[PDB]
């Protein structure tokens, strides 16, 4: 989330840990522990916000400029980001799949 929006989280964009004796299915919000990646606001875009704005047309004296909202942005040169935080309850490692190519595995 961005500043002063701790109540907001991406619908499936955070690690959610269960409290002790939390139900397997349909645990209430009070029975789960939402993580927050707000520390990476400084470098990573907010998960629930658009990446930015791009031009959608060519403005002329008769056509006003139009803007497009970038809701999905792949790697661009000059882009920097932080990885997701690790947690005491969270995983340590994953096997990088044996593939021809990966990006930031």
């Amino acid at each position: 989330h961005k500043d002063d929006e701790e109540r907001f989280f991406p619908s499936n964009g955070i690690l959610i840990f269960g409290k002790q004796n939390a139900a397997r299915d349909n645990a209430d919000y009070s029975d789960v522990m939402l993580t927050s990646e707000e520390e990476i606001k400084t470098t990573n875009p907010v998960a629930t916000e658009e990446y930015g704005i791009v031009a959608d047309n060519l403005q002329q004296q008769n056509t006003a400029p139009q803007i497009g909202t970038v809701n999905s942005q792949g790697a661009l040169p000059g882009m920097v980001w932080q990885n997701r935080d690790v947690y005491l309850q969270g995983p340590i490692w994953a096997k990088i799949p044996h593939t021809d190519g990966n990006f930031h595995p």
């Binding site: 799949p97 044996h98 593939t99 021809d100 190519g101």
Partner: protein, 105 residues
């Protein structure tokens, strides 16, 4: 990695350029500064050999069931696949890919 497939090389196998050296026809007996455009009609033939050493990655698989393999069809046919026909024309009946063995991700 090249999009039509294969190996992307910063320094690929160099282009091998070949040309028949022009052999002028009889020039005039009085000097002319103009470049000669009368040439003996000429072509060359020869043999070309290319030897490539390929390194192989052997499959080290614990898969129990048999793998998919490229195989020729057992059933009878008018001509042998990847052979010549009655007119001496060699044909490749299908594009043979490369991915038949399996790996885990």
């Amino acid at each position: 990695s090249p999009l039509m497939g294969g190996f992307g090389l910063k320094h690929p196998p160099p282009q091998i350029l070949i040309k028949n050296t022009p052999v002028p026809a009889d020039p005039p007996t009085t000097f002319n500064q103009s470049k000669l455009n009368s040439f003996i009609t000429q072509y060359s033939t020869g043999q070309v050999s290319v030897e490539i050493e390929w390194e192989l990655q052997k499959e080290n698989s614990k898969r129990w069931n048999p793998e998919i393999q490229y195989t020729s069809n057992y059933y009878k046919s008018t001509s042998v696949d990847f052979a010549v026909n009655t007119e001496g024309v060699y044909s490749e009946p299908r594009p043979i890919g490369t991915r038949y063995l399996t790996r885990n991700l």
